[PDB]
C-alpha cells in the first residue's frame, strides 16, 4: 500500500565458500531512526527450513544473546547491512530485514544463503 | 476523492498568513500523546521548533522552519506518539496541507 | 523459558473460517504485544496484526482487514487468530510472535508455526 514504509533486500540469493565475509542489503523507503532513544528500528531475522525465524538483531546492531559476534548489523538512517564473517554450514538461512518503526510493520523479501 | 490516510486529530488546522496553528479540542499530558514535525522520509526537522501557547493550547508551526516547500503551497508531516514507551510502531501519522500565500 | 505453543495444522474447505490460538509462557501476558505473520510457501514473510492483552488493542495491517480477527484470553494467556472466508491464498503458515515492548516491540520469540491448507 502507498505510504507504508518498504524494504528492499539484496541480494535474493548468495553463494559463499565457508570462511568467506559477506554482505546482505538492506534499503528502506522511510529514516527508521527514532531522536527519541537514538536507536534504529530495524532487526534482522534467521530461517532454517522447517524452523520458525529467530531473532539475529535487534536496534540494527544488536546482537540477541548468545548469537555469535560474527554477525554484524550496521548502517543507519535508511541504510543498513547485515554481515557474516566467516560463514560456516549452520549459517545456511534465508535471512530477512524487518522494520518495526512503522505501521504496518514491514520485512524485506529475503536473502537465501548457499554454499558453491 | 484524492486518499489521505490521516487518521483522526484532536485538533482543527489553521493555516494563517504568519504561521500554521492546530488548537486542541481539549488539554491533555503532552507527554503521553507527543507531536514531532518530520521531513519527507520521515527524519525529525532539527531546525524546527513549534510552540505551545498554554492559553488556549495551540500548537504554532512556522512555515519556513517546519513544513516543507511544495509547488502549491506546505506539507506538514507530524507524528504523534507515547514518549513514555519505546513502542514507535503504535504512533499515529499525520500528513497536513496548507496552501501557498504571498 | 519463554515459549509460545500454537495449536496444530489445519486443513479446511474454501468459505469457512479457522481459529488458531497461542499459549504463552515465561513472562507477563498482559504487557507485550501479540503479532501475527503470514508465510505462503516460498513468499517470505508477511505482517498480519498485532494484540495488546492488557487492554485487548488491535492493529491491523488493511490488507487483512475483515480477513484476521485477534481475540486475547488472560486467565489462558492465550492469543486467537480468526481467519475468514477462507480461499487458496490462505493457505500458509502462520506464526505467533512476542512483541516485547522493553525493547520497542521486537518480535523476540516466535511459536512453531500453524500450517492452514484450503483446498475444495
Not at chain 1, 63 to 87: A, H, K, M, N
Not at chain 2, 59 to 79: A, D, H, S
Not at chain 3, 50 to 72: E, M, R, S, V
Not at chain 3, 84 to 89: A, H, I, N, Q
Request: proline letters at 4%; a negative charge; one cysteine or more.
Amino acid at each position: 500500500e502507498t505510504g507504508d514504509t518498504v524494504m528492499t533486500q539484496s541480494p535474493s540469493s548468495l553463494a559463499v565458500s565457508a570462511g568467506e565475509t559477506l554482505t546482505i542489503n538492506c534499503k528502506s523507503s522511510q529514516n527508521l531512526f527514532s531522536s527519541r532513544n537514538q536507536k534504529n528500528y530495524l532487526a534482522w531475522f534467521q530461517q532454517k527450513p522447517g524452523q520458525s525465524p529467530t531473532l539475529l538483531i535487534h536496534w540494527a546492531s544488536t546482537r540477541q544473546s548468545g548469537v555469535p559476534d560474527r554477525f554484524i548489523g550496521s548502517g543507519s538512517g535508511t541504510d543498513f547491512t547485515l554481515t557474516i564473517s566467516s560463514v560456516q554450514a549452520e549459517d545456511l538461512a534465508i535471512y530477512y530485514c524487518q522494520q518495526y518503526y512503522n505501521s504496518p510493520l514491514t520485512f524485506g523479501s529475503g536473502t537465501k544463503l548457499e554454499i558453491k | 476523492l484524492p486518499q489521505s490516510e490521516n487518521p483522526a486529530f484532536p485538533g482543527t488546522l489553521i493555516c494563517d498568513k504568519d504561521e500554521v496553528r492546530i488548537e486542541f479540542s481539549s488539554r491533555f499530558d503532552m507527554e503521553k500523546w507527543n507531536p514531532s514535525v518530520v521531513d519527507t522520509l520521515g527524519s525529525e526537522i532539527l531546525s524546527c521548533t513549534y510552540a505551545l501557547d498554554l492559553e488556549r493550547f495551540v500548537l504554532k508551526f512556522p512555515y519556513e522552519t517546519c513544513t516543507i516547500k511544495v509547488v502549491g503551497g506546505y506539507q506538514v508531516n507530524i507524528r504523534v506518539g507515547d514518549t513514555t514507551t519505546d513502542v514507535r510502531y503504535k504512533d499515529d501519522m499525520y500528513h497536513f496541507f496548507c496552501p501557498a500565500i504571498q | 523459558q519463554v515459549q509460545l505453543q500454537q495449536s496444530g495444522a489445519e486443513l479446511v474447505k474454501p468459505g469457512s473460517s479457522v481459529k488458531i490460538s497461542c499459549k504463552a509462557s515465561g513472562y507477563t501476558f498482559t504487557s507485550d504485544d501479540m503479532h501475527w505473520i503470514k508465510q505462503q510457501p516460498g513468499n517470505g514473510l508477511e505482517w498480519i496484526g498485532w494484540i495488546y492483552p492488557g487492554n485487548d488493542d488491535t492493529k491491523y495491517n488493511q490488507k487483512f482487514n475483515g480477513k484476521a480477527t485477534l481475540t486475547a484470553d488472560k486467565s489462558s494467556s492465550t492469543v486467537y487468530m480468526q481467519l475468514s472466508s477462507l480461499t487458496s491464498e490462505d493457505s500458509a503458515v502462520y506464526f505467533c510472535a512476542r512483541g516485547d515492548l522493553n525493547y520497542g516491540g521486537s518480535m523476540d520469540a516466535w511459536g512453531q508455526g500453524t500450517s492452514v491448507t484450503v483446498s475444495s
